[PDB]
Amino acid sequence: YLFQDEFDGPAGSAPDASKWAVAKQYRDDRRNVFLDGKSNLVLRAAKNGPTYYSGKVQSLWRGGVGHTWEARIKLDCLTAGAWPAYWLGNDDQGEIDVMEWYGNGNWPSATTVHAKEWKTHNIAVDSAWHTWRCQWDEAGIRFWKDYVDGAQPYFDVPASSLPDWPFNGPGYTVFPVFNLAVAGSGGGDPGPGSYPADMLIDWIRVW
């Protein structure tokens, strides 16, 4: 693999500090961002009195065009207020939102490519383990859920379809992000929700 983390390690420990920056409400607290000892990174949103704390990690590694990206994710957080997301970010222009689920009761879970000009596709996601695959090459960006050899992508965004396509710029790269947001537009009010809520990631691989 060009980049991977299998999130192996003792229960309660931090994700690999050579690969991830833990967002510092997000906090760098092992109660909210921790390896579970069973090969998963856990991002946990928890209520501390009136206040919610949760977790987010950003990859220190950035990858460019021509690769396939896949993560295995379990959403134990499909509740009001919660907003789990797996995305490939860029500081400047563009974003690949591989998988988002919204706790606001209004927006369907979806995959979205942003050029600046965006394309979105609704996805179903429940609380079971699923894999989420993104191939991003010169010609476009396409996606699979629970890939098996020869499966067709559920969503294909040709580079040509978005005139302001940033992704073929020289040296353009993206960083993987996993986060479990609470409230905001996508999460809605967490009051009626069930906390603590967990987003689990078994692995991310890029090749």
Among 28, 33, 55, 63, which residue's Cα sits nearest to residue 135?
63
6 is in an annotated binding site: yes
Is 70 known as a binding-site position?
no
Nearest approach, Cβ of residue 200 and Mg ion (Å): 9
Smallest gap, in angstroms, from Cβ of residue 188 to Mg ion?
30
Complex with Mg ion: residue 6 or 16, whichever CB lies closer: 6
Q: How far is the CB of 202 from Mg ion (least distance, A)?
A: 4
By C-beta, is 131 or 173 nearer to Mg ion?
Answer: 131
Which residue is closest to Mg ion by CB? 39
The answer to whether 100 is annotated as binding is no
**Which positions lie near Mg ion, rule CB under 5 A?**
6-7, 39, 202-203
**Residue with smaller CB distance to Mg ion, 73 or 115:** 73
Task: State the nearest-atom distance from the C-beta of 193 to Mg ion, in Å.
Answer: 27
User: Is the Cβ of residue 42 or residue 115 nearer to Mg ion in the bound state?
Assistant: 42
Q: From the annotation, which residues make up the binding site for Mg(2+)?
A: 6, 39, 202
Q: From the annotation, which residues make up the binding site?
A: 6, 39, 202
